[PDB]
Amino acid sequence: PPTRVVIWLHAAPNLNPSAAGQAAPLRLRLYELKKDTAFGRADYFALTDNAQSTLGGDLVEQDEFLLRPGEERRIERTLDEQTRQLGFVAAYRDLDRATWRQVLDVPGQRTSHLDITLGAQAIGIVARPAP
């Protein structure tokens, strides 16, 4: 069986607020990874503008989404057979205060369901059980 992932993305009402607290859109990048050590050590600009150079062979695919406050999406992927982790980078306005990066080891040849919340200042991931 393929490694199957379903992700429900929930962009909060208070998504990525301005300096005034007005909610604003958030760019999110999803990375399929063979290894995640470099990913977790890399600077933001290196991951966003130079990912292939920065990650080399570790990087299988990169996907980009622009989410709006209150938005809901469902995405489903089969992860490449070499792909062991999913990485996430969110372009929060103030990266100092934000949990703007997450990594997740995904068991191979099994089904994983995830609820991923994009909050005012953090990516939150929660396992979603079957069915």
Closest C-alpha among 2, 1, 7, 5 to residue 73: 7
Domain count, the chain: 1
Dihedral sign, CA of 60, 65, 71, 74? negative
- The CATH number for 10's domain is 2.60.40.4150
Q: What is the 3-state secondary structure (H, E, C) of 17-66?
A: CCCCCCCCCEEEEEEEECCCHHHHHCCHHHHHHCHHHHHHHHEEEEEEEE
* Residue 45, domain extent: 1-131
Which method was it determined by?
X-ray
Q: How far apart are CA 120 and CA 112, in angstroms?
A: 25
Q: How far apart are CA 100 and CA 91, in angstroms?
A: 7
Give me the resolution in angstroms, 1 decimal.
1.4
Measured CA to CA in angstroms, residue 51 lies from 46, 57, 120, 128, 131 at distances of 6, 11, 25, 29, 35
Tokens 């990048």 locate to 29
DSSP character at residue 122: B
Q: How far apart are CA 81 and CA 11, in angstroms?
A: 29
